[PDB]
Symmetry: C3
Subunit: 295 residues, 3 copies
């Protein structure tokens, strides 16, 4: 796109504030930002806030979100679809023109680990170019295993294709498949979907800890066979809903847009790979590392 030539918009922080016991304001941008998705490979991503996947959003069950999108793209319209919410897509997930803002309000009444993404036609194009992310809705009564958990992180799986190439998007295999981590607490890493960062700077944990991961596979196109090497998932909550409880799963099947909360114990010091077990995808980037130390 001629109007994207030379465009690299610096990342903008997510803006979020609570405005009542059950109401939260969220402000995001749609912007065009160079991301190093593999060593030496820059993708001029269509993004929320200059991150792909986008910034993490965390709300409580029963929060109404008053969402603003500021569209910094000089020429492409953008929008927002939160899977967490009940909304009219044709009224509430509508386009915001270049250099304009739009505000939309809707309730998140279901707990879980939900995909968000741009909903501008063609949606495949907007997702594949990078406009995806996760919103976590925390359950009013927790998870039955909350007391057992020592440490938590968020991981997101996505693919990258040939740049802005709709033929490849629809008919081609992914060039890269990648994990990223998004921060829940201060000092947690916050990364983009790339083939290397979580190998070179592993997630950290202590020997003996029960780890919770909030996970979502945003696609756009592939399913994920989520697995942590050297452990077994003690508990799995499909879509992060507490009712959808499985136990003792080696591998969690995630549809495209599918999420889960998974919990597992790391019993011994070492580095534990985290993979999609569809190994072609793993080979093309989708391996993260968890480094487990005696401290």
């Amino acid at each position: 796109i001629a109007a994207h030539k030379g465009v690299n918009q610096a990342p903008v922080p997510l803006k979020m504030e609570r405005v009542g016991p059950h109401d939260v304001h969220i402000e995001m941008t749609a912007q065009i930002t160079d991301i190093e998705i593999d060593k030496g490979k820059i993708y001029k991503a269509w993004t929320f806030n200059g991150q792909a996947p986008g910034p993490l959003v965390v709300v409580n069950e029963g929060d109404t979100i008053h969402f603003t999108l500021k569209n910094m793209d000089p020429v492409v319209p953008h929008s927002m679809d939160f899977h967490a919410v009940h909304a009219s897509p044709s009224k509430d997930f509508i386009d915001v023109m270049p250099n304009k803002s739009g505000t939309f309000t809707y309730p998140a009444n279901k707990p879980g680990v939900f995909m968000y993404h741009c909903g501008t036609k063609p949606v495949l194009q907007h997702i594949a170019n990078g406009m995806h992310g996760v919103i976590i809705v925390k359950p009013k009564n927790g998870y039955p295993t909350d007391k057992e958990v020592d440490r938590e992180y968020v991981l997101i799986q996505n693919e990258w294709y040939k740049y802005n190439d709709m033929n490849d998007f629809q008919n081609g295999v992914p060039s890269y498949v990648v994990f990223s981590s998004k921060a829940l607490k201060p000092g947690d890493p916050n990364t983009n979907g790339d083939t290397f960062t979580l190998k070179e700077k592993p997630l950290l944990a202590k020997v003996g800890e029960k780890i919770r991961l909030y996970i979502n596979n945003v696609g756009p196109n592939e399913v994920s066979s989520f697995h942590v090497v050297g452990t077994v998932f003690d508990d799995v909550y499909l879509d992060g809903n507490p009712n959808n409880h499985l136990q003792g799963m080696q591998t969690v099947m995630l549809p495209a847009s599918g999420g889960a909360v998974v919990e597992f114990t790391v019993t011994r010091p070492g580095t534990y790979p985290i993979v999609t077990h569809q190994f072609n995808h793993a080979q093309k980037g989708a391996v993260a590392m968890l480094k487990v130390t005696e401290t």
Copy 2:
């Protein structure tokens, strides 16, 4: 196939009648019928009754089906495999020659949303050419959420490939992926697997209604990441068995031949897309629309 050149057999209604408290007769044809699968694109489908997917069958749990297939194909043998039933495949799912009929009897003792399809070798060929459909077996004691449901529809996902091309069938990506709807009550639409009809003539509902969809992904080859935009599934019953209860799912993973019953609430007026969230497939046709009005 030379003997299919110029052949376009007009659709024949499904014939069905109950013959006892636990016995039903079903009569279908195998026939060769031109279907417009995308605008301007005619596929000379191998079909049951001139529809692809085929006509909807609905029986009660515990019904024995006395099934007749009348094969109108001038040259290809056809057969029928109902996933709902317990049967000897080598006795009961056998070929019916051109211009002949065959009758087969077997029990449907399990509730759910089951695939049917031709079982003639090579089965990939017969399915990919259009010989698939759904049979619903209604549970003797219902679903625990029956009282909450205001409106119901059936949706079926399938793919289309290059015409009768076994290399493409086995090794190629789908050309189109599509939804169709099959009527449960008078006035419901009844459509074929195409890229457009359910966009141009959306399914209808009223603001505030809880909608049930009976869904199956007949493939032949892809899995489906079933999602309704702007809602969350309140309840999901895997394969339509009441025991396989999930709650609060954003997206339902369906294997090839996989079914579900899903329920969700439409809270606001508008048009709600229904997709497989594998967006390459969505782009290639697999988006239906639900239009929600104040009436």
Copy 3:
């Protein structure tokens, strides 16, 4: 690989012995062995013990495994990752050099049907060349349906690609997709992943029996839509964990590395195909047969 030219190492039996109430010794090899994966097609597989998938391992819940790998490959390092176990991957799933042995110890504290495989980088290469298998961990308290089961078998799904071709492994469709069976009791068949053996020598059963299959889809890359023609799964335990109970499933979605225990009734004499319902894969080999007789 020049050092594999002309190499065909005869299969070596699995060595296994119990050494205490909760401890078992297992000795396997990594070796290079010609396998006929389709009629006329020899693949010089990288294997455990000259079988691909490898030999079946069965332990009890709570057994500690003292595992030895003897690496007979003249030039490639190999390793072992059991999904059943809690282990440090960077200490316990490490490489064994050509002509050396290594011993590793770790607990199997979770019941189920678990993948094992070589964990040597690039793991896609080692898995795709044949270094995969299943370990069954029997639950201390059984399955609630144990008393109903008349007969049991193990089935494993895997793919084969162009020989040792990492481009094909990562970017290509499978050449073949196959089932194999591995023996649980004397007289059970024990086969390799091929397109024909389980068609030509079907698994056997008696009319009216409830059959249990322990199943795993080892990939490397595809998911599986597991289905038995002419029946419905009465009970399904995801990953073989007794808690992950589904009922009345026509088809079981398995991620890559995913397992299950499935139970179904064969009501009538005949031959019952067993398929992945992703029919492109079925066409390329993934159909096994169960022959059901009045004896």
